[PDB]
Ligand binder design. Structure first.
Ligand code: JVQ
Ligand code: JWB
Length: 164
């Protein structure tokens, strides 16, 4: 019942590989549907050709600001922002897919993939999926990050979509 979506990612134009994500529509259907639709681009906008703007090694890889490309932008398929659906899923370890926000009830399109357990975020960021394959691709993305979050190469989602 849960969608599988994919991100194909490159660094300075050179392909890194494919990340496949399960979206937990069974637990957070509104939040899963937002991410799913932004991967397909079927509302006329989405993640295709946007960047991972903030990458911090031993923490997470953040992306999804397709409007401003600096982490101050992005929007949902519902409107500019939508409520925190629930906090049932937890930041249990590497590969967890969660929503970036600017406080309670400010979910747009920005998201992050954890490269460690980020349990401090539990109850503050809505977890809505995890990495099914391509965690080696996430580590490659991670390697181009820095402690400050600034990336050493331009990391781009060159293509994305839905597998099932
Ligand atoms: C809160 C301002 N703003 C943009 C935005 C920026 C973010 C974020 C979520 C959003 N929400 C979508 C629309 C919106 O209202 O997570 C971290 O940076
Ligand atoms: O984008 C922002 O302005 C704040 N922001 C981040 O820098 C990342 C890490 C800290 C919380 C989660 C993970 C995500 C987020 O919302």
């Amino acid at each position: 019942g849960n969608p599988l979506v994919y991100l194909d990612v490159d660094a300075n134009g050179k392909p890194l590989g494919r990340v496949v994500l399960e979206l937990k529509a069974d637990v957070v259907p509104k939040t899963a549907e937002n991410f799913r639709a932004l991967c397909t681009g079927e509302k006329g906008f989405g993640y295709k050709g946007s960047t991972f703007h903030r990458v911090i090694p031993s923490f997470m890889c953040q992306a999804g600001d397709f409007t401003n490309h600096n982490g101050t932008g992005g929007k949902s398929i519902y409107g500019s922002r939508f409520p925190d659906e629930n906090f049932t899923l937890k930041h249990v370890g590497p590969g967890v897919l969660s929503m970036a926000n600017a406080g309670p009830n400010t979910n747009g399109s920005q998201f992050f993939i954890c490269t460690i357990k980020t349990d401090w975020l539990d109850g503050k960021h809505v977890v809505f999926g995890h990495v099914i394959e391509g965690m080696d691709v996430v580590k490659k993305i991670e390697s181009f990050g820095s402690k400050s979050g600034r990336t050493s190469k331009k990391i781009v989602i060159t293509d994305c979509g839905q597998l099932s």
